């Protein structure tokens, strides 16, 4: 049983998103489907359930404003959100089962939802730098929204890689850095670029890194 | 609302019971009582369902019950892996309603204690010349998880303009974290130096650099 999320993002309050939930290893069309979010550093909370027969139901806060479907010939369940808040941010799961005479045994990976006017901005990467070792690193400052990724050339050096996890600023933009160590002899004989790929923005920037 | 403690530990080997309490209208009304277990980044995984029932593959240490409108999950031969947290869930009667408790925070004792690696970085010369100047204080591999950071200019301390992240665990089962300050230009020159000091357990480690 396989459960592949899509169609999170960044949107204003009172815009529509559709998020999809791709399956396979059962039929969508003959079983029972759920929505549960969970909003930043917060507990889970049930959305939305189909039956097996297509009757439909809807917590509180989001009747009226979205709607749970299917595609039998896809496989696909969504779920339509409309007129959305900014109480609704929070990682979207879709899930097998009703939540209680079928429990959710098996999840989706989760897909991200940011209701926000704030503008999304693209990251400003800095370079990070000093025989013996040499720590090198890039800093990703100022963007919005999450995630950034980082790789390092081009994803060819993982090893002694370590990505932190991001700072959210007073000005309400993030920042984080990526840092890797190194022989110093190799600065000069071999290239660092980190590759710094915010999705959000449609950007890939790419910093090479030396001293 | 099904009410659960915000936190509960115990060390390995032993028991531990978490509680969740709510009313005859789901908890004390139906046998439709699930346990949910959650690790950072993770979807919730199904332990127990119908207040005992277990799905396939779920240990037999994890076990449900419930006495009148509290249900409790129990935890023998706790590992450290068992650290997550855990989230009862229960139907309301009506409409599909499944309401989730807050979920409690399990921490297992005993885990080594483990002192932080800290890397201090300069601001980068492309960064001053956009008359902006971060220092970068990276701190990785300790725990337990509470650090306390104290930058210093000189000898002296600096409170402003600093954002630190809260420590979280890295692939390694250890905790990272980074500091930023923000200086001006101005500031960075006209001082001999500048530190990032990690006070963790009774132990500091330092790291300084200059212009």
């Known amino acids: 049983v396989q459960l592949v999320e899509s169609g999170g993002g960044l949107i204003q309050p009172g815009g529509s998103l559709r998020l999809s939930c791709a399956a396979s290893?059962?039929?969508?069309?003959?079983?029972?489907m759920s929505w549960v979010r969970q909003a930043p550093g917060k507990g889970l909370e049930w959305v939305s359930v189909?039956?097996?027969?297509?009757?439909?139901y809807y917590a509180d806060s989001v009747k009226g404003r979205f709607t749970i479907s299917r595609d039998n010939s896809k496989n696909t369940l969504y779920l339509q959100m409309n007129s959305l808040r900014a109480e609704d941010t929070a990682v979207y799961y879709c899930?097998?089962?009703?939540?209680?005479?079928?429990?959710?045994?098996?999840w989706g990976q989760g897909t991200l939802v940011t209701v926000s006017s704030a503008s999304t901005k693209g990251p400003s990467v800095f370079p990070l730098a000093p025989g013996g070792t040499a720590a090198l690193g890039c800093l990703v400052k100022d963007y919005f929204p999450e995630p950034v990724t980082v790789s390092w050339n081009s994803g060819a050096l993982t090893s002694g890689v370590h990505t932190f996890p991001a700072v959210l600023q007073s000005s309400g933009l993030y920042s984080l850095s990526s840092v890797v160590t190194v022989p110093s002899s190799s600065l000069g004989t071999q290239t660092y670029i980190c590759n710094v790929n915010h999705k959000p923005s449609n950007t890939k920037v790419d910093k090479r890194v030396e001293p | 609302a099904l009410t659960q403690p915000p936190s509960g530990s115990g060390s390995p080997g032993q028991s531990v019971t978490i509680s969740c309490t709510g009313t005859?209208?789901?908890?004390?009304?139906?046998?439709?009582v699930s346990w949910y277990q959650q690790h950072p980044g993770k979807a919730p995984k199904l332990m127990i369902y119908?207040?005992?029932k277990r799905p396939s593959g779920v240990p037999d240490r994890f076990s449900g019950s419930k006495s009148g409108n509290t249900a409790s999950l129990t935890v023998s031969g706790l590992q450290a892996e068992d650290e997550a947290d855990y989230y009862c869930?229960?139907?309301?009667?009506?409409?599909?309603?499944?309401?989730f408790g807050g979920g409690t925070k399990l921490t297992v004792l005993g885990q080594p204690k483990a002192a932080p690696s800290v890397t201090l970085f300069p601001p980068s010369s492309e960064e001053l010349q956009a008359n902006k100047a971060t220092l970068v204080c990276l701190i990785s591999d300790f725990y337990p998880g509470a650090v306390t950071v104290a930058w210093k200019a000189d000898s002296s301390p600096v409170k402003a303009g600093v954002e630190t992240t809260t420590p979280s665990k890295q692939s390694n089962n250890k905790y990272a974290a980074s500091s930023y300050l923000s200086l001006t230009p101005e500031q960075w020159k006209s001082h001999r130096s500048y530190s990032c000091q990690v006070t963790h357990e009774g132990s500091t480690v330092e790291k300084t650099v200059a212009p």
């Open positions: 899930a097998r089962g009703e939540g209680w005479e079928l429990p959710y045994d098996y």
């Open positions: 290893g059962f039929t969508v069309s003959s079983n029972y």
């Open positions: 189909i039956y097996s027969g297509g009757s439909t």
């Open positions: 005859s209208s789901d908890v004390g009304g139906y046998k439709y």
């Open positions: 119908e207040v005992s």
């Open positions: 869930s229960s139907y309301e009667g009506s409409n599909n309603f499944v309401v």
